[PDB]
Amino acid sequence: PTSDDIFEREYKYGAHNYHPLPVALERGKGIYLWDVEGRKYFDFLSSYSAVNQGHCHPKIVNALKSQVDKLTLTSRAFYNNVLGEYEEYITKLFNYHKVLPMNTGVEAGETACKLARKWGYTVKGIQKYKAKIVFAAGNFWGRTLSAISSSTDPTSYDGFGPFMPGFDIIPYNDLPALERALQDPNVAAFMVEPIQGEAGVVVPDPGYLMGVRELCTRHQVLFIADEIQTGLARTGRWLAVDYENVRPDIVLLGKALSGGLYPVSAVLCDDDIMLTIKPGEHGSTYGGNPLGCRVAIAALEVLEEENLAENADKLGIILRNELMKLPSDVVTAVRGKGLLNAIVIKETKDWDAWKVCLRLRDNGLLAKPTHGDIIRFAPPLVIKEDELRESIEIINKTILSF
Amino acid sequence: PTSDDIFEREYKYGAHNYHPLPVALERGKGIYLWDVEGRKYFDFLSSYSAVNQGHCHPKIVNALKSQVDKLTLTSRAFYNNVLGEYEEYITKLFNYHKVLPMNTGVEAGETACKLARKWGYTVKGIQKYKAKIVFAAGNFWGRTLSAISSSTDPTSYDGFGPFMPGFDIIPYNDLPALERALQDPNVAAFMVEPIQGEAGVVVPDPGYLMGVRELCTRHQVLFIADEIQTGLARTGRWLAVDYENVRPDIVLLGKALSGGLYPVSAVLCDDDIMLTIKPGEHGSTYGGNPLGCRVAIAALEVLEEENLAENADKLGIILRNELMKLPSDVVTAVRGKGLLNAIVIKETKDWDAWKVCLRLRDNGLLAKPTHGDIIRFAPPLVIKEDELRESIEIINKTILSF
C-alpha cells in the first residue's frame, strides 16, 4: 500500500481525533525512520519523548523477546518474580521509598491525585472531600475527564461535560500566585511540569522550582513533579528538577521508561504518602506486569550506561546556539534544555509552522508544530554531533527557503 | 530468591495497594502457571480475563517478536503502516464504522464517557455541561477519579476527594429504574456490563439487555456496553450482548484484546457518534502504536480460528453442573456464563473464601475471592474437558476438606 492508501484507510476505519503530518513510517532504528517508499528521515519528535533511547534499541528489544517466552501477565492478584526486582531498582535509582506501577502517563497522574487527596484526608486532616490540588496554566497530563478539568486549553475540555471539582489553576512560573493559592488550608498538593512540553516547551525562570519546593514545604502541601516528558535524561539530567537540586514529594515517570516498546509509567514517593492507600483501594490490570518490568529495567540501564544525560546536555547547547543564528523575522524565539527544545515561527500571510514541517519532511526531517506556530525539536538522545549537524543544516535550508 | 524473598521485597519497595494470594509465579503456558519452586498450577483467574488465549500463546508471541524488530512507536503525530490494517479488521469483525484505539480498560471507559457527552451536546442538543450518564450499582470500569465516582463500592471511592458530577446510579438488572431515570432529557447515555465481573459475576435476568436497548433507543440515549471483561469469547459468544442479539451504540473492549502481551483497549461505534470528536480533541501517547496493533490482530485471530467461543460455552455448562453438586451448606450459589463463573462460599465461624483459595492453591489451582465470600472460576478458554475435569476434582476435594 502507498502512503496515500495508508492515509485513506485510517480515515475510513479510525476516529478522526488526530491530524498527523502526512508520512507513513514502517521501520525505525536509532534516530532514523523509513516510510513505505523507502525514504529515510531524522526523527525530531521521538514520539513525544517516548523513544529517548532511539527506536528499537537492541538491549530493550532483547529484554522483551526474552521475557515473552516465560511470562507476560499474571495480574497483581498473584505475585510474579520480576516486579519486585524492578521496584527495588527504580526506587533506589531515584531515591524514594516505594513505587506504584501503572501503564500510561495519565494513569500516573490520576494515581498522584488520588495519593494527594487520600494523604490530605488521612494524614493532613482535611475534611472529607474538601481537598484541593493546584495546577499551573498551560499544563498537560493526559486526556481523562480529570486531566482535561485542570486544562486551560479549550481543545481538550470544550464540550466534554461537567468538570472535576477541587482543581485550582494558577499562572505558571509565578511564585507569588502559588503562595497566594497555598493560603487555603484545604490544598493537599501542587502538580507542575518542570518544563511545559505540550504547551510549547515553556521553561520557567531559574529559582522557580526551588521556590515551589520551599512554598510547598512551608504550607504542608505535597509537591508533585510531572516528569513524564522531561525526565529520563531528556533535559540533560535524570530529572529536570535536578537542575535546581529539589526533591519533589511525588515524581511521575512514563514515556521513555520503556524506550517506546511498552506502556509503562510510575509514581514514586516515601512511605508516609504511599501507604495511605490500603490493599484493594487502587489498581490496574496490566500495571506491573512481568513483561513491562523487564523492558523498563532495560530502558533505564541504556540511559545510565550510555550516559545519555550528558550527551543530551552538550548537544542541546549546540542545537540552541545554531538555531539562534536564524533570522529574527522568521524565528522569533528559541528555547529548551537538553534535547527538549522548540522555536517560535513568526506566522505570516504566507507561512506557518505546519508548512515549515511539511518542507522539513520533504528535506529528510520529521517534526510537529505544538500550538500553531511553535515547532519542537526533540531527537533521540542517542544522536551524535555530526548527525545533529546534518539535521541542523536541513533545518537551516528549509527555514531559509521560505 | 524464594517466594518469601519475593513477597518481602515487594512489601519494601512497592505500594501496598494490593494484597495478593501468596504465590510467586515465574512462567506460564496455556492454562498453567509455575512458581519459583517449580510447583505447577491450574490458572482459574486468567489475569481477570486478560489471557483468554492462555499464557504466552505462540501465535501472539510470534506477532510481537516480529514487529519489535521493525517499529514499536511513532505516536499518532505521524502515520504508521499497521494501525489502519488493525482498524479495518476489528471494525468489520464487530460491524461498527470506526474504532478509537486506547491502551488500558479505564481509558476505553473515559473515552466512551467523552463520546457520549460530546454527542449529547453537539448532536442531541443538551445544554452545555448538563449532560448525564447513568450507571448500574455494582459497576466497575477502572480506578480513575471518574471511574470511582460512579462506584457504589466504598473501597474504591472512600477518601478520594470530591467526585465527578453528572453521574447517576440506578440498581443493576432493573428495567423500571432505567425507564424512570431516562425521563430526564439531559441523559446522554447508559453504561452497563452485560455481566458484572468484579461485583462477583452477577448475571442479569434474561430479557434485561433487550429491555435496555429498547429503553435507550426510545429515549434517544446511547447504550454503552462495557465488554472489557465479558467480551472476546469469555461468556460463550464474541460479546455477552450477543446472547440477546442486541447492538449497543458503543462497545468497549480490552484485556484479552492482546492475549495479555500488551495493554490494548478499544471503543467501537458508528460515524454519527465517533465523528463528534475532532482532530486534537482527544488522544493517547501509546494509543494505536504498531506493536500493540500486531498483537491485537493476532489475539483476535486465535479466538476465531480456535473457535474458543463454543469451547467456552460447552465447558462452562459442564463446570457449572459439577459445581452445583457441592453441598448447599458450603456453596450457597453457582453462577456464570461460558468460562466466566463464580460460587458463593457460605462464610462461617471457621472458613471463608480466602482460606478456600489458600487450600485450593495448595492442591494445584489458582483463584481469587472477589468480595470476601465469592470465588471466581475463570480458566483460559483453551482449557480441555479432561483438564477441566482434573481441576473440578481439585475444587471438590478442597471444598469437601473443610
Ligand SMILES: Cc1ncc(COP(=O)(O)O)c(CNOCC[C@H](N)C(=O)O)c1O
Ligand atoms: C468490566 C471492566 N471494565 C473496565 C475495567 C478497567 O480495566 P483496566 O485495564 O484495569 O484499566 C475492568 C477492570 N478489570 O478489573 C481488574 C481489577 C484491577 N486489577 C484493579 O485492581 O483495578 C473491567 O472488569
Ligand SMILES: Cc1ncc(COP(=O)(O)O)c(CNOCC[C@H](N)C(=O)O)c1O
Ligand atoms: C508531561 C506529561 N504528562 C503526562 C502525559 C500523558 O501521558 P499519556 O501516556 O499520553 O497518557 C504527557 C503526554 N502528553 O503527550 C501525549 C499527546 C497525545 N497525542 C495526546 O493526544 O494525548 C506529558 O507530556
